[PDB]
Structure 1
Amino acid sequence: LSAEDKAAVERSKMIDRNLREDGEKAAREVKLLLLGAGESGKSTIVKQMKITGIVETHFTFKDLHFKMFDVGAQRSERKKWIHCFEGVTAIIFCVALSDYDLVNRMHESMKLFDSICNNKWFTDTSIILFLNKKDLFEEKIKKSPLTICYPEYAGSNTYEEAAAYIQCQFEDLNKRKDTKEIYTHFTCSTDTKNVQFVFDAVTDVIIKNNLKDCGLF
């Protein structure tokens, strides 16, 4: 019990106090991983919400802090570092819905959604799917049919049925329909309706986590 060792123990306890203070501060913040195809329109969602491999967006809404990680700028194989993002609250996945007739992008977007949704690391993490570019789509359905991308589509050419059809084609791709739900929202230029839907989905995930913590679920 020397004098220097007691000062080292006191320094270690002060460091432990700072570690637990920073850990309890970091525990309440909600982390969201944003994914999607190249030039799908993720930057539009980023610019709409309030504000180098990963650029980190930190913003608050109704006293709940969100840290949003969009990693689409990095060009590398996803699966080898994707286990860094385990334990994430939600994955906001952006799909360019009006990109069907350009030759095709919808099919590798579905392959990317199958790779992310059926991944072994994200079996219990919810995925919030966003369908953007709504305004151009009816002007591209009136001139060009949807039968080119999917031959099985049999229906009248209108936004109201084709949008629900694309929603169901993305929603039924999951192989675990009981554990992880797919939340589909058509992003529009409303007064932060997007942020509201994200807050409701994060609220449902926090409810599920609290139910797992208590032991009811």
Structure 2
Amino acid sequence: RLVKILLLGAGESGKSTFLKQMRIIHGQDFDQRAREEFRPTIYSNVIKGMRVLVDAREKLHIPWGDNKNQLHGDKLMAFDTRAPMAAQGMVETRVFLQYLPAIRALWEDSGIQNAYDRRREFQLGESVKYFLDNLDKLGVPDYIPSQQDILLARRPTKGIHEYDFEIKNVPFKMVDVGGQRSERKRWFECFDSVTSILFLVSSSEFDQVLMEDRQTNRLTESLNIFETIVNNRVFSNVSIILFLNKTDLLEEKVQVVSIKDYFLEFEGDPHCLRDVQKFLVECFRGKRRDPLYHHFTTAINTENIRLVFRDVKDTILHD
């Protein structure tokens, strides 16, 4: 009688972001106190994020936009990411303010920026850019993360998490899980009484490799995971819906990187969002061996998810 929905997808595909949207759109939302709890995470995203950047500038031998930024680079690398609080992805406000001047200087440095543009050569989430471009609002002493800030904050997921909610008297239970290889062993514990699977794919990961083994192309991994799921007879009764998430990032990306450089099959305008989206859909549809529903989403955009979930709900209820 309950509509149970499982969120699956490789690491960083946007599962937890979708989860948060369900709470904002159909649940209690996030009051100020709840949003304040994300502050430590947000400050941590930024410090660790900038640290990866200066480490990348160096190792990729990218020149400094200005040598004086070397001293700021030194301050950041000296930050111990293995200390207690940092280990669990958190940073106090007072400590964050000590690194602010240096972080702001580094973000303005063209070498640092160049390194960011070459992030596919290492591992870095694109939301660190969002927070670096908003250092001003993060720096005020009375800063309270906005709803948008909350959706962008990066908190790696380990283990299983449930979130119950209702939509017009229908009870929903959504299950969220981690997506890295090591966390997928926990996927089998939830497949019980599952009505539907939402499979998230970061549509803009075609030029990136896995964090697990910096060699396997991300889209390849997503495709293979999907192929094992959709072809498993145990799931013939379950409604699988595909979410080509991060549409906004894909849109930007196709303007500077070509999918042809990573997937030969592509024959069309690599600068055309519509052609890349069609190609991606084809890739996933082609994996089924024997009605595959799909949506292009932007999990960080509440309005988009609101209209997308309405379609999902109708599909599931009618199947």
Specify whether residues 84 and 67 from structure 1 end up closer, same or farther in structure 2 by C-alpha distance, changes over 3 A only. closer
Structure 2 distance, partners of 1:173, 1:204, is 25
Q: TM-score, normalised by structure 1?
A: 0.72
* Partner residue of 1:143 out of 256, 274, 299: 256
Query: Aligned residue for 1:208?
Result: none
| Residue 37 of structure 1: aligned partner | 10
2:219 to 106, 116, 132: 106
The TM-score normalised by the length of structure 2 is 0.50
Please give the secondary structure, in 2, of the residue aligned with 1:142: coil
Which secondary structure state, in structure 2, belongs to the residue aligned with residue 166 of structure 1?
helix
1:47-62 equivalences under 5 Å are: 47-50=20-23, 51=27, 53-62=159-168
How far apart are 1:76 and its partner, in Å? Answer: 4.5
- Evaluate the alpha carbon distance shift between residue 45 and residue 30 of structure 1 in structure 2; reply closer, same or farther with a 3 A threshold: same
What are the Cα deviations for residues 95-126 of structure 1, in whole angstroms up to 9, with x where unaligned?
11111112310001111101111123212211
Q: How far apart are residue 134 of structure 1 and its match?
A: 1.0
**Is the Cα–Cα contact under 8 Å of residues 13 and 201 in structure 2 kept in the other structure?**
yes
Q: Is the 8 A contact 2:199 2:243 kept in 1?
A: yes
Deviating beyond 4 angstroms after TM superposition, the runs of 4 or more aligned structure 1 residues are: none
Question: CA contact under 8 A between 1:34 and 1:69: conserved in structure 2?
Answer: yes
CA RMSD of aligned residues (A): 2.1
Inter-partner Cα distance in structure 1 for 2:296 and 2:258: 20
More strand by share: 1
Cross-structure match for 1:182: 292
Q: Secondary structure at the match of 1:39?
A: coil
Number of the residue aligned with 2:280: 166
1:59 Cα offset (Å): 1.0
Given that 1:130 and 1:184 are in contact with CA atoms closer than 8 Å, whether structure 2 keeps it comes out as yes
Is 1:72 paired with 2:178?
yes
Provide structure 2 residue ranges, at least 5 long, that are not aligned to the other structure: 28-157, 210-216
Compute the displacement of 1:163 (Å).
0.7
Q: How far is 1:38 from its partner?
A: 0.7
Letter in 2 for 1:33: L
Question: Rg larger in 1 or in 2?
Answer: 1
Matched to 2:297, the amino acid is T
Q: Identity across aligned pairs (percent)?
A: 42
Unaligned runs of 5+ in 1: 1-27, 206-217
Q: Confirm or deny: 8 A CA contact 1:53 1:73 kept in the other structure.
A: no
Q: Deviations over 1:84-105 (max 9, x none)?
A: 5144211011111111112310
Which has a greater percent of helix? 2
Task: State the alpha-carbon separation in 2 of the partners of residues 198 and 57 from structure 1.
Answer: 17
Instruction: Tell me the residue number matched to 1:153.
Output: 266
Higher relative contact order (CA 8 A, sep 6+): 2
